Design a protein around this nucleic acid. Structure first.
Lengths: 260, 146, 218
RNA sequence: AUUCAUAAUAACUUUUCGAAUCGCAUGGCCUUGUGCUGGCGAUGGUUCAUUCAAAUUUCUGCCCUAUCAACUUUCGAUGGUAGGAUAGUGGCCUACCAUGGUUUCAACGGGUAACGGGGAAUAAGGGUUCGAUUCCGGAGAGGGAGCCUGAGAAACGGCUACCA
RNA sequence: GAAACUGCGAAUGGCUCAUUAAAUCAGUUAUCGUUUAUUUGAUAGUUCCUUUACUACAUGGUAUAACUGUGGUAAUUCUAGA
């Protein structure tokens, strides 16, 4: 139909934004950006549904226009900015540093960290390729391309990249027995290990995941994301630690913690 | 199940960017390029030693094999470089809880390193559509009962 | 008809309404661009060699250039050609038009003096109007005053005077393309950024080559 | 899975791109010329990448109809070679060369008060009817074709032609 | 801070359901079969000249709107001459 959609109604955005059905037709429709509009979250729903620092889009626009919100270190005045996975949205005013990591349930929640670890974001690589003047380069999943890598890096390896240097720091070579953060499907937002790895050559190779609490599952491989060493993750983790309790014991934990 | 000469039509059938240098004495009698099809499949020995061209072949050729991989028997062979498959299968019905027998047809590009005829259960993968019906290139063959 | 006559050298223009058919009919069989003398329409116009410029018919539908076979006609028009300013960019339109060869119902013709004769006309010979807005590019000012390369064209610009109700003050055009210390610092910064980014990529390549030698050392 | 990324050679090209730009600050120097350096951020500018996309495309799946049993080919019907076209594959079109392709497991033709899907109603279970309509996908701007502009439209709150 | 020149967008939204019955469409595929403004991130040291009597880089050209004035036609978001 003649060209690109710029509207997007409510009941069509992802569900991890947790928008109410009413008080509009529309839903804040990410611009083009680093992160996909299924896996990102705009700053406006971040600020006014998840942090409650405004009540109006008027307000969120003035807030961003005051040049405090340094999403990956850079001031953003764009309401429709797609803040997505492993994002280091920091401030100066409240001096707080939010990292967009998920829930156990699959929802971009709040994760308030220090200034240390507000200075590096991780990233899965998704193609490594050779370019002009014989220069190799490596992609991430925000689209950060980086020239001159460590050649030890392959595809599906993760990288710690700082904020402003680029300058690829401690990467992780991908293999078995590593802590990963599965970020898709129903296994979205659970943490486990690389107990087994399988190649179905030609279509959609997979990886067995065992968590800590003896729950095997088996994910696809564009949902894998290495967060590091065995019991040693390079960043901090939310409550639950990506473990996905059953619903009855979930209710039992809620009821027991309900009251003293 | 016929074949032809070396060059037939009004062009000179070769592969692109393959240059049998006339100045250097070619000890071998050609520079025959090919590739490996992948998906575990094996290039036939006839393909490497052969003397066809067929730019639509997965072997010594310019298209590539990806997408769905399938099998089926062969019901027609009377085209030039294409056969006609009949993927026989059963269709369920929820209401009657009972299957019903059904079929389609999906004509594939028989390459002249593959000797086929009626019978011949074949295996065949998807290859960037070639003409209006044919999206599939035969990669492996087998006989019918004997 | 009605005839507008224009003299650019003094910059003026005026309409007359001559009706003497024996005078008017000498301009027939003439397209736009030709030159005449108006001794038929007036002995006051004797020696004044003209050049016909254009005009409108008895319905206002104008003329153009190369618009021959002169009855009123329709034509598909585009940008950059007259009789139509495009109201949405890219759009073309089919507007009517009239032929340039002078016929009888050309209700307004307008023309220019290209060669002055001998007589006097009250509003186009002695009455002069200068230009309204002066030169504003630096080289236009230099050619307007015949200025050299380093003649400091800043303070030789056309100053215009206005009073508000009493408070008199001058104003001047803001000269664009002036070589400024602004542009000096800008060219300096841009060239320095270029050469420094080049040297940084060179040194990064060198460090990467050292790292690859260390990897190949195994 | 590659003739893939890339790299090099030999050249070619109406030789594409390589900031004649702007706003704040006004800082460091000595060989004071009123000289030399100098930040913050605004648009652009080439390719690659990402994103928003779009177009094709694999598979499988549709209501009634035999008072529709054969259909397809001048003028492409199926397939090849090669060229043009195109964003790009492709009978998409053209030359040439073969008669193919579909079908009683229902083709082709007819109806429809046929947009489809998400779903709705009624509900023991198995189902039956409906879905123009709050979302996705489609399609159209009176009927029908053509085309400028533009990354994107066969745009109609654009144009041109005819018809009503 | 009017008017215009420029760059952008007016292709999104909105409406209806007439057509179309393997067509669309839903799942499930591919781009090793291609375009893509935008946003994000990378990225650019070479342009002329037998490389000595060079040929603006403290920087090169006219060519148009808004404006000024003379006008048309009963009449258009019509426009012409200067």
């Amino acid at each position: 139909a003649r060209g690109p959609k710029k509207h997007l109604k409510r009941l069509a955005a992802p569900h991890h934004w947790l928008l109410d059905k009413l008080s509009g037709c529309y839903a804040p429709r990410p611009s083009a950006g680093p992160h996909k509009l299924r896996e990102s979250l705009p700053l406006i729903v971040f600020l006014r549904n998840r942090l409650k620092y405004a009540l109006n889009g008027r307000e969120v626009k003035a807030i961003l226009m005051q040049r405090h919100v340094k999403v990956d270190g850079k001031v953003r005045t764009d309401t429709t900015y797609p803040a997505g996975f492993m994002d280091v949205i920091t401030l100066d005013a409240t001096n707080e540093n939010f990292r967009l990591v998920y829930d156990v349930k699959g929802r971009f929640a709040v994760h308030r960290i220090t200034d240390e670890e507000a200075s590096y974001k991780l990233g899965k690589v998704k193609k490594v390729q050779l370019g002009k003047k014989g220069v190799p380069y490596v992609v991430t999943h925000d689209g950060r391309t980086i020239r001159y890598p460590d050649p030890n890096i392959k595809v599906n390896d993760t990288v710690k990249i700082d904020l402003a240097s680029g300058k690829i720091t401690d990467f992780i070579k991908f293999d078995a027995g590593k802590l990963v953060y599965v970020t898709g499907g129903r296994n979205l937002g659970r943490i486990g290990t690389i107990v087994h790895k399988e190649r179905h050559d030609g279509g959609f190779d997979l990886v067995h995941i065992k968590d800590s609490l003896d729950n095997t599952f088996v994910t696809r491989l564009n949902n894998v994301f290495v967060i590091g060493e065995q019991g040693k993750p390079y960043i901090s983790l939310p409550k639950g630690k990506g473990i996905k309790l059953s619903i009855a014991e979930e209710r039992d934990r809620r009821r027991a913690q309900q009251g003293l | 199940s016929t074949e032809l000469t070396v060059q037939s039509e009004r062009a000179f059938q070769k592969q692109p960017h393959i240059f049998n240098n006339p100045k250097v004495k070619t000890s071998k009698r050609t520079k025959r390029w090919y590739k490996n099809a992948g998906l575990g499949f094996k290039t036939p020995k006839t393909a490497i030693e052969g003397s066809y061209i067929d730019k639509k072949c997965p072997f010594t050729g310019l298209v590539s094999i990806r997408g769905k991989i399938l099998t089926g028997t062969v019901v027609s062979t009377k085209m030039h470089r294409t056969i006609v498959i009949r993927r026989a299968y059963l269709h369920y019905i929820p209401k009657y809880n009972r299957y019903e027998k059904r079929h389609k047809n999906v004509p594939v590009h028989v390459s002249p390193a593959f000797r086929v005829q009626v019978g011949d259960i074949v295996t065949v993968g998807q290859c960037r559509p070639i003409s209006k019906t044919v999206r599939f290139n035969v990669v492996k063959v087998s006989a019918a009962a004997g | 008809m009605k005839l507008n006559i224009s003299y650019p050298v003094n910059g003026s223009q005026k309409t007359f309404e001559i009706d003497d058919e024996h005078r008017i009919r000498v301009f027939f069989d003439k397209r736009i661009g030709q030159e005449v003398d108006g001794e038929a329409v007036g002995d006051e116009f004797k020696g004044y060699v003209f050049k016909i410029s254009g005009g409108n018919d008895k319905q206002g539908f104008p003329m153009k250039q190369g618009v021959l076979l002169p009855t009123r006609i329709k034509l598909l028009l585009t940008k950059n050609v007259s009789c139509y300013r495009p109201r949405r960019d890219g759009e073309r339109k089919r507007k009517s038009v009239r032929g340039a060869i002078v016929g009888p119902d050309l209700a307004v013709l307008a023309l220019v003096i290209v060669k002055k004769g001998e007589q006097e006309l009250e509003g186009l010979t002695d009455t002069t109007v200068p230009k309204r807005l002066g030169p504003k590019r630096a080289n236009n000012i230099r050619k307007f005053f015949g200025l050299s390369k380093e003649d400091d064209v800043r303070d030789f610009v056309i100053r215009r005077e206005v009073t508000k109700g009493e408070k008199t003050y001058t104003k001047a055009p803001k000269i664009q393309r002036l070589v400024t210390p602004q542009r000096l610092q800008r060219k300096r910064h841009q060239r320095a950024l270029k050469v420094r980014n080049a040297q940084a990529q060179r040194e990064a390549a060198a460090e990467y080559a050292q790292l690859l030698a260390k990897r190949l050392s195994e």
